[PDB]
Amino acid sequence: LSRNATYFLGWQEYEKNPYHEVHNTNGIIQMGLAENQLCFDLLESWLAKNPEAAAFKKNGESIFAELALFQDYHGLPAFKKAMVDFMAEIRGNKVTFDPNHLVLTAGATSANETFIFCLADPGEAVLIPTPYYPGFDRDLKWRTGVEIVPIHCTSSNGFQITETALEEAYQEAEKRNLRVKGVLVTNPSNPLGTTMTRNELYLLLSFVEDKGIHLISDEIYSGTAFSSPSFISVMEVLKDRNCDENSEVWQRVHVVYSLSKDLGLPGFRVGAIYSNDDMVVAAATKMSSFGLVSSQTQHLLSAMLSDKKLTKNYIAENHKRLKQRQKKLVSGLQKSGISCLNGNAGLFCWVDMRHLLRSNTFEAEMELWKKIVYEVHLNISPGSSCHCTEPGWFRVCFANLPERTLDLAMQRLKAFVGEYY
Amino acid sequence: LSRNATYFLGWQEYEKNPYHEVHNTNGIIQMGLAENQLCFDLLESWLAKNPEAAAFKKNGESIFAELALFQDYHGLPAFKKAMVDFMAEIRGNKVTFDPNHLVLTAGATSANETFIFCLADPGEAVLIPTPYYPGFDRDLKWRTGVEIVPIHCTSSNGFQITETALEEAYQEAEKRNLRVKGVLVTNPSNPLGTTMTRNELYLLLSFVEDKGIHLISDEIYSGTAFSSPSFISVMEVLKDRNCDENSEVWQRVHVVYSLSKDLGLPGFRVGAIYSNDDMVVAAATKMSSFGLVSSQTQHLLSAMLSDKKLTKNYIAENHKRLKQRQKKLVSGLQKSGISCLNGNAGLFCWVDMRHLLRSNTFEAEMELWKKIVYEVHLNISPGSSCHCTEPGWFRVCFANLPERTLDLAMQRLKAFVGEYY
Ligand SMILES: Cc1ncc(COP(=O)(O)O)c(CNOCC[S@@+](C)C[C@H]2O[C@@H](n3cnc4c(N)ncnc43)[C@H](O)[C@@H]2O)c1O
Numbered sequence: 001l002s003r004n005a006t007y008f009l010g011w012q013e014y015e016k017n018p019y020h021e022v023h024n025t026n027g028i029i030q031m032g033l034a035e036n037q038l039c040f041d042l043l044e045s046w047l048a049k050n051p052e053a054a055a056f057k058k059n060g061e062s063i064f065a066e067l068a069l070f071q072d073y074h075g076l077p078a079f080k081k082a083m084v085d086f087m088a089e090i091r092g093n094k095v096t097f098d099p100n101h102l103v104l105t106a107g108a109t110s111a112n113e114t115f116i117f118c119l120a121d122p123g124e125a126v127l128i129p130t131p132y133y134p135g136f137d138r139d140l141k142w143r144t145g146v147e148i149v150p151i152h153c154t155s156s157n158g159f160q161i162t163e164t165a166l167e168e169a170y171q172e173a174e175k176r177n178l179r180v181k182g183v184l185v186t187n188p189s190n191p192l193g194t195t196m197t198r199n200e201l202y203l204l205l206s207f208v209e210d211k212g213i214h215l216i217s218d219e220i221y222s223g224t225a226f227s228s229p230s231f232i233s234v235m236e237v238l239k240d241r242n243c244d245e246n247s248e249v250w251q252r253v254h255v256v257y258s259l260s261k262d263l264g265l266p267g268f269r270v271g272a273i274y275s276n277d278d279m280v281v282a283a284a285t286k287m288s289s290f291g292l293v294s295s296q297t298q299h300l301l302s303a304m305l306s307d308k309k310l311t312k313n314y315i316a317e318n319h320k321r322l323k324q325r326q327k328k329l330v331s332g333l334q335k336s337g338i339s340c341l342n343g344n345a346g347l348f349c350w351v352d353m354r355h356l357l358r359s360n361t362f363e364a365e366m367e368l369w370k371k372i373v374y375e376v377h378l379n380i381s382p383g384s385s386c387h388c389t390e391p392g393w394f395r396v397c398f399a400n401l402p403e404r405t406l407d408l409a410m411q412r413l414k415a416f417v418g419e420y421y
Numbered sequence: 422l423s424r425n426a427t428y429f430l431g432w433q434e435y436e437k438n439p440y441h442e443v444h445n446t447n448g449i450i451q452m453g454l455a456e457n458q459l460c461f462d463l464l465e466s467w468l469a470k471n472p473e474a475a476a477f478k479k480n481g482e483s484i485f486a487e488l489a490l491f492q493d494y495h496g497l498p499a500f501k502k503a504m505v506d507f508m509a510e511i512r513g514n515k516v517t518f519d520p521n522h523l524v525l526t527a528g529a530t531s532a533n534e535t536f537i538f539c540l541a542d543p544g545e546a547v548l549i550p551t552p553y554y555p556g557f558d559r560d561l562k563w564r565t566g567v568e569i570v571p572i573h574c575t576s577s578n579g580f581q582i583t584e585t586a587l588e589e590a591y592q593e594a595e596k597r598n599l600r601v602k603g604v605l606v607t608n609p610s611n612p613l614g615t616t617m618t619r620n621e622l623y624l625l626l627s628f629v630e631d632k633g634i635h636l637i638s639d640e641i642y643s644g645t646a647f648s649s650p651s652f653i654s655v656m657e658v659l660k661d662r663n664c665d666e667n668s669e670v671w672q673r674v675h676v677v678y679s680l681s682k683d684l685g686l687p688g689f690r691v692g693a694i695y696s697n698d699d700m701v702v703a704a705a706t707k708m709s710s711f712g713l714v715s716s717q718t719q720h721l722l723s724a725m726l727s728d729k730k731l732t733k734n735y736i737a738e739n740h741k742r743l744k745q746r747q748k749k750l751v752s753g754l755q756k757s758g759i760s761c762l763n764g765n766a767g768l769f770c771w772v773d774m775r776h777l778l779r780s781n782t783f784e785a786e787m788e789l790w791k792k793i794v795y796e797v798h799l800n801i802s803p804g805s806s807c808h809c810t811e812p813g814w815f816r817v818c819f820a821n822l823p824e825r826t827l828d829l830a831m832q833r834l835k836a837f838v839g840e841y842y
């Protein structure tokens with residue numbers, strides 16, 4: 001077989017003994033799965049009121065044959081139009097997207113890998129701010145032969161990207177004899193739970209301009225920014241500057257999007273690539289061939305997203321319920337004397353548990369982590385799994401479980417800190 | 422951008438002037454698109470009688486949230502079970518498939534590339550019998566860095582694979598300094614329209630055993646074998662031999678399947694990988710992450726395929742209508758004094774038009790091809806596009822257009838041969 005052919009304790013323990021309000025009340029509570037189960041009722045109500053799309057019907061007529069045959073990698077026109085409209089709405093209509101520059105893919109997972117395939121050759125690299133979504137270690141490197149060089153961020157400044165961290169990253173790549181092709185960021189951030197600052201964005205654009213490299217912004221959480229400071233898409237910063245089709249960096253700024261986190265439809269595999277570079281769009285379009293979005297799904301979501309009443313109310317309501325749940329987690333944690341990095345987006349909080357470590361080491365972090373799993377029966381993510389340089393931080397999700405289960409988790413954790421500390 | 426980032430006349434002319442019974446009767450008739458539009462009515466009737474699956478309902482209950490959240494790359498259990506049952510039924514239940522060894526992918530396009538990623542490293546190669554599906558030149562090589570070495574087949578023996586052709590292929594690879602990792606075949610064959618013979622299969626199994634390489638059988642057309650000789654899956658040949666988990670080749674024989682051609686649902690992107698090798702299944706499962714099948718689609722098709730009455734009648738009816746349409750094309754061609762390679766499967770015929778060429782050259786072939794496009798307003802595929810070693814053969818599809826349009830095409834072609842020959 002080829003070479004390609006050849007932190008899990010929390011989950012393996014979870015599957016063996018999963019928590020359930022009635023069938024297993026002693027099970028481990030899931031707080032490490034970043035999924036949104038807060039607004040399904042809004043989608044179910046829409047589906048009940050508008051049954052035709054899911055029924056393969058349009059204006060009373062059957063379009064099953066037409067959809068069954070639609071396999072064009074340019075994507076369904078009506079669906080791409082609805083998607084760009086939705087992406088603009090998410091950004092307060094401060095930026096518009098050309099549907100001809102959008103490429104549909106089977107989830108952001110597919111989109112990110114495709115971008116790497118189009119922008120870097122095997123042996124080259126991309127810079128990524130730490131901590132970062134651990135899925136990237138496989139998604140971005142596995143079949144691409146591309147390497148990841150970290151741009152270290154620390155708690156000192158709220159885990160923000162600095163000019164010095166970027167140069168040190170660029171320097172590490174050189175020392176490893178790796179040619180840098182770009183920087184990939186997550187905005188809003190997983191696992192930080194914060195929106196990138198305008199300052200960081202200009203800092204990034206200036207850096208990629210100087211180095212003549214690419215900037216890929218994974219904005220899958222763009223619709224989940226529920227509190228100040230405001231979410232700023234990388235595309236917005238380009239407009240209000242000489243980069244507005246008056247520079248070169250404009251062609252090297254790209255966005256990745258998905259319906260997995262805001263709408264909570266990860267199973268449907270709706271991802272999107274957006275680029276101003278005509279050649280990247282052409283290349284990605286052909287690559288999408290290996291991971292197209294089901295035409296049945298494309299039709300359903302074009303109908304849903306074309307409804308301006310649904311999109312408007314969904315975003316507002318999603319923001320409301322997410323904010324409510326995040327505050328509940330923050331308040332719950334405070335009662336145990338546990339603080340969080342001040343966040344305003346995502347489906348999780350970046351929790352500070354440094355003062356609960358035996359010592360300032362990752363060995364201590366894994367120790368604490370295992371205690372929470374076996375003693376507290378809570379599954380969360382140790383920061384080292386996200387490549388955070390300082391031991392003690394944890395990602396704790398809050399949008400996948402019922403409010404009452406969240407409270408249960410908090411009181412068990414409180415019982416824990418009072419018992420061992 | 423990376424390197425990856427950087428025969429069409431018939432289609433470009435088609436899009437500019439596409440044929441239509443009422444809106445453009447002088448348009449070019451499409452006979453180069455291998456799609457099945459013969460049995461949509463059977464699927465529409467089932468959907469009308471069983472509306473719950475498409476409605477996200479099971480036993481009267483809504484399962485929208487559950488499906489929306491299902492993103493596991495091991496695939497929906499009920500759907501994989503229905504798929505293996507269907508694959509066995511297609512093969513007359515002569516072979517059974519373990520659902521734990523099946524991996525769902527976004528179409529066979531995705532499945533084939535993934536198999537290449539798991540079996541060969543960049544710089545290595547796979548042998549493929551010519552003529553072959555031109556999509557392979559991009560699908561199998563583009564992002565994999567793998568090369569294709571042809572196993573030449575000629576009309577002398579009905580375009581069958583011979584021991585000598587295999588060794589000559591294996592020899593060409595060596596001369597090009599390429600290490601061979603396996604052979605990929607299409608059974609039934611696109612564009613031949615023939616089922617592989619038991620003789621060819623044993624010949625292939627013996628060859629891959631000797632060379633210690635893999636055998637990948639793309640059986641996407643397995644359900645479209647409508648006439649004798651019988652279709653024989655590569656998996657069947659393994660059973661009735663010492664290869665029945667009593668050898669080594671057993672672990673190196675793999676199958677690719679899809680619902681794009683038999684059921685005519687290419688837009689839904691339902692592909693499948695099947696392998697006896699535990700490691701290949703594990704690897705492919707993780708790779709499917711880049712191209713998963715929409716859970717909405719998985720649910721719908723698990724319901725459809727779980728209905729034994731539908732699957733039985735669909736296969737029988739598909740066989741009937743396909744056979745009827747193929748005979749019509751064969752008879753239509755005979756009237757113009759044009760013969761076809763005796764075939765029994767697929768959605769197309771491999772047509773012999775050598776006697777209509779100015780000379781025995783590919784330049785002559787392209788000449789004739791362009792005449793049929795501009796003079797006859799018919800779009801078919803020149804054999805050279807499929808890498809056929811002898812000029813003059815063409816692939817002509819018959820399952821995508823109405824019977825009357827097919828006849829129209831035949832009479833225009835007859836008018837052509839009588840006018841220039
Ligand atoms: C910043 C960021 N970007 C993109 C994504 C992916 O979202 P899409 O749904 O649009 O692709 C995420 C979040 N991803 O969360 C879910 C991870 S799955 C989609 C992909 C990922 O997970 C690994 N994995 C492990 N076990 C898996 C099972 N059982 N099924 C599927 N995937 C599974 C994969 O190997 C892969 O790396 C995000 O935060």
Ligand SMILES: Cc1ncc(COP(=O)(O)O)c(CNOCC[S@@+](C)C[C@H]2O[C@@H](n3cnc4c(N)ncnc43)[C@H](O)[C@@H]2O)c1O
Nearest residue numbers: 071072073289528529530554556559607611641679681687
């Ligand atoms: C033997 C054989 N195996 C597999 C397949 C693929 O079937 P799936 O639908 O299960 O993936 C086929 C037949 N494929 O026929 C359709 C070709 S598409 C699925 C993929 C293929 O076509 C190229 N292409 C060119 N223009 C395209 C547009 N506009 N949309 C999609 N694909 C398009 C791609 O670059 C790719 O190589 C078969 O015979």
